[PDB]
Symmetry: D2
């Protein structure tokens, strides 16, 4: 099976149950591992982005799902972890392309920007869409790794 | 207020659009074009890296990056310490990336988002100031600490 | 002041309070007139679209706000009423342009597609943005009226 | 399965794109182009009306309409009895317009939505069938009753 770590900030916690469900809906082979806040209390998105991102980078899980108001902060923070390719997605097309082109391992969504049924579609599309494997994409992904190494 | 612009090959089609949209944001905004000179095939991480390093070094205040979806641009740019690159798809995301995240690079998808919405995104990104709020400052500092820890 | 009638279907009823608030946020001159379901009970979107659309067409109110899952059914149903120009909006740009170009009098939104903070921005933008008045737009709007008259 | 296509002048730029995207949906899908023959200025309601009447008459099964935002297209087309025109901005809206509303016309914004998302919208619209569900049938009939009452 394929483990999928999930994290949110405080307001996106409203939909953490949704996110668990949508991971499961992508197929029986996907196992949600919830790592978000246990409560509605105030938190800082970078702490939860880091947590999920580290799990992905250390390969404890295959994929990450991160949600906050816009998804923007989650995508910035998560990408700061070497080995992470986190994609802010807003529709089916970006969800699919992040996998096909970028072999993205983390999907980020905005709970105050994107309606829940579109978030559902984003998560399912992201999990089900395979990486293309094509020459140019592999080269570009390796160049991103090169950038990490240079810092 | 200098603004470095980069694209890949497909998005090169709108590089003159992006230069124009930066100027439309105000007389003080100065575009510095760093993308491909031709329509020939290039790799997005190279141009992401060029723009991102300029922002990180403090050579320009802002960056603008375009490719098909904007996704690879935002991933590659964020690998540079000091960069906070925001993939925006509308006015709301453009504004909030500045207000919440003090984003210094805006990424757009030329194949996903129409040019008139791209225009709105770039103008909003440049014109909208960072809120300076306590919580945002703290969280931005936490991102910097994630960079440092790696 | 400027009266703004509001209608939803059953699931979008979850945010009817939001919609009332956002109308008020556009300015003190905008008065929300709630005409949606009073309860979470099952309803048919055309009945509520019609209700708000008729109010706009008879000029009892200046503007309408309609919400359902996607906003699509509301825009179809509302446009069936002569005198109504109902715009399905998904962002700030479409909200502004519907006013500038089409002098739209009803804004439709999808509660399951568009996040609430973007719905907020759509409603404020739609109410605050004036119709341009330009020659070509007036001609085109009159042509839409011509289409109504021919049926 | 015939599909009538109309645009205004700016969206005329992608009229060959739309023809191609209709064909990509399947061999059975036949585009019938009814938009402007040149880039010269026209009024969107005229082309909306042409396509919409064809759908209403049962001359074609589906219509595709493009302009800057798609908004005027969806308003004008819906003025024709029997038309259910859906302004779509993504895969989800394209699919749901068919599943819930049995939409017969798809409207897109050439200045708001990128061409690759437009491609996805048109293919999804044509390939996705109406659910036939009881509630949807009833609500669609209620729309027809609103037409009749006017």
């Amino acid at each position: 099976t394929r483990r999928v770590a999930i994290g949110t900030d405080h307001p996106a916690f409203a939909i953490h149950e949704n996110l668990i469900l949508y991971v499961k809906e992508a197929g029986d082979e996907f196992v949600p591992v919830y790592c978000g806040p246990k409560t509605a209390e105030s938190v800082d998105y970078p702490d939860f982005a880091s947590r999920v991102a580290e799990m992905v980078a250390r390969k404890e899980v295959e994929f990450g799902v991160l949600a906050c108001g816009s998804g923007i902060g989650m995508s910035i923070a998560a990408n700061k972890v070497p080995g992470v390719r986190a994609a802010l997605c807003h529709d089916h097309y970006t969800a699919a392309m992040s996998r096909i082109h970028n072999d993205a391992n983390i999907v980020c969504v905005g709970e105050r920007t994107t309606g829940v049924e579109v978030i559902r579609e984003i998560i399912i599309t992201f999990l089900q869409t395979p990486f293309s494997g094509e020459e140019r994409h592999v080269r570009r992904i390796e160049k991103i790794r090169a950038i990490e190494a240079s810092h």
